[PDB]
Symmetry: none
Subunit: 24 residues, 32 copies
Amino acid sequence: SKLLELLRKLAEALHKAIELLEKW
Amino acid sequence: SKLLELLRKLAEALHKAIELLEKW
Amino acid sequence: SKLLELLRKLAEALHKAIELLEKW
Amino acid sequence: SKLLELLRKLAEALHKAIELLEKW
Amino acid sequence: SKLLELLRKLAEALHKAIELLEKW
Amino acid sequence: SKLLELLRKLAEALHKAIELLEKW
Amino acid sequence: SKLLELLRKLAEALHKAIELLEKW
Amino acid sequence: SKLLELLRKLAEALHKAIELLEKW
Amino acid sequence: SKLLELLRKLAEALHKAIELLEKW
Amino acid sequence: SKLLELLRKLAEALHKAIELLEKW
Amino acid sequence: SKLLELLRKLAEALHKAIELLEKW
Amino acid sequence: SKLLELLRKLAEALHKAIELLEKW
Amino acid sequence: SKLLELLRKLAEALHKAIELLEKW
Amino acid sequence: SKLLELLRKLAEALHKAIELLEKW
Amino acid sequence: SKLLELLRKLAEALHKAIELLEKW
Amino acid sequence: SKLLELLRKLAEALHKAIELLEKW
Amino acid sequence: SKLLELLRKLAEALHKAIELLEKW
Amino acid sequence: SKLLELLRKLAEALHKAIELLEKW
Amino acid sequence: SKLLELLRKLAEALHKAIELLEKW
Amino acid sequence: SKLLELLRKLAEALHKAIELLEKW
Amino acid sequence: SKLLELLRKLAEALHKAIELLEKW
Amino acid sequence: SKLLELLRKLAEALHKAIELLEKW
Amino acid sequence: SKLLELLRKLAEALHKAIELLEKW
Amino acid sequence: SKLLELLRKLAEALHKAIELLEKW
Amino acid sequence: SKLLELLRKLAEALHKAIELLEKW
Amino acid sequence: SKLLELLRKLAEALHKAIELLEKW
Amino acid sequence: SKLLELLRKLAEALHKAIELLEKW
Amino acid sequence: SKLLELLRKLAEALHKAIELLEKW
Amino acid sequence: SKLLELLRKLAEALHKAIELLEKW
Amino acid sequence: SKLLELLRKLAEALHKAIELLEKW
Amino acid sequence: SKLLELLRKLAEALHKAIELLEKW
Amino acid sequence: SKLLELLRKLAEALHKAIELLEKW
């Protein structure tokens, strides 16, 4: 489930990315 | 930035949805 | 309760989404 | 937008409704 | 009093809802 | 549809009733 | 005295109710 | 329907009456 | 004059009320 | 029913009297 | 001439009152 | 009861007098 | 019609009045 | 005393006179 | 004495009534 | 002002009139 | 105003007349 | 005295009343 | 007797009522 | 409080009137 | 019985209403 | 005391009011 | 069909609503 | 049970309300 | 009717949510 | 399964919802 | 306009995400 | 294939997200 | 704090991603 | 923006990287 | 294949590197 | 190919990431 790990990780990248955008 | 706040709700929704997917 | 928590996220999201629509 | 205000009212209701079901 | 919080929301909804229905 | 007027006014009573009751 | 607000709104319901009922 | 005509009048009275009481 | 309007409302009520008692 | 008829006259009178006060 | 209309209500009241008096 | 007759008659004078005044 | 009604009453007053005067 | 008799008679005369006048 | 005072009360009002009528 | 003098005298008479008849 | 001569004469008569019967 | 004044006013009444009737 | 009470009350009301109206 | 003493009085009267026709 | 019960309900409503208005 | 009574009355009134208009 | 249902529901709701807030 | 009954009442109210809104 | 299809959908969801917690 | 229904419904709602929002 | 492109892609992902998890 | 499409969906949105972030 | 949180997630994405790449 | 150099580099890397693992 | 081994190692290195960086 | 592009972007990350760490 290499792809499953990536999908949870991609969710993490987006979450932090948007938080920063929202702040700014 | 309420369009950005909607994005954040969508972002979190994907997260919870794929978090479930990853564990199942 | 991982599907129920996904539902809690999604609930929050739609509320703020429609609040944004009304605001915009 | 009064039809939108009904939709935002329902959204608030659903989020709280599912929050309560989810806590249970 | 979470059940009371849900029923408060349903009352708010119905106000805008039948307002709209009668008006329409 | 003065019956619609009655339903909307019974809604007024019920919404005031619940907000007061939910406080209590 | 949001109880006074409830009584006045229950009056609203009753007055609409009786005018409709007295027609009938 | 004379009894209904009296009770219609009592409802009208109570409107202005508790309006006034709450307002006072 | 809202206190006068309550008094005129009551007057209308009493006249009708006694008219009904008098017819009986 | 001569006292009851005097009451019917007097009922009418007070109504129009207070209506006049409100009008003047 | 609503002050005159109040007078007429008073006039009729005296009439009914004394009509009773005369017969008794 | 000479005075009783006069009082019913005085009521009659006034009643007609006011009707004419009201008209004019 | 009504003007003639006043005049009938004027006469009536005087007749009951003189009946009283003469009774004494 | 006979002055009161004439005076009653003249009251009665005008009443009867104008009873007819009004008819015509 | 009250019966005489009522005769005087009617007179007072009727003097006023016809004083007015004559000037009109 | 004849109309107001009439009103006071009407009221005087009506107080007296019904006071007198009420016990009887 | 030949007929208002008559009206006025009738009132003037019943003034002095009722004065006399009440003064007895 | 006031009886001859009663008779004076009855004369004025009669004079105008019967003048009318002949003028018809 | 209870009916006399109603009429007695109405005379009392009319007195305070006219006190107000003439006072204006 | 003239206008409030009037309101109170009107209410007492109506209560009695209706109490009797509720029995009747 | 249902018309009688409605009026008995309006009596309780108006009773409580005016009691509190007499306080305020 | 008095406010809780007035709310109980309005509820009882509106139960009865709507009972009857559901039948009509 | 549907309107009578909605009125019956609002009555039943408001019975329950006021039951509970009378206890609270 | 009373909180559950309140929510069941609001379910019936909202059911009927939206059914009719979907018609209109 | 986009906005009304949205309203309908929101309602269906809330009904299911509450139906389950009414059982629970 | 009934819970999956709720979430399935919410995805469907979100699709029509965003169709509207992006379309603006 | 990056924000709207993000919104459409979020929705695409969330439709797909939960479609995929729902049966599983 | 849907699991791969979700990876691409997250990417599309995240490209958009950081494109925006970098220009901000 | 939050900016450092993004950076941790950026790394995570790449590690799950390269794990997948290398698994193939 | 040395740290925004780093941010941008990380995204550019994961772009080509995920392109390659999805293209497999 | 050994290219993928180095590339996994560099991902892991940056994750570990910045884990510490962020702490400090 | 795209693996050497992955490695190019990992180098840019590393260069900036470790520059930061030495600059602390």
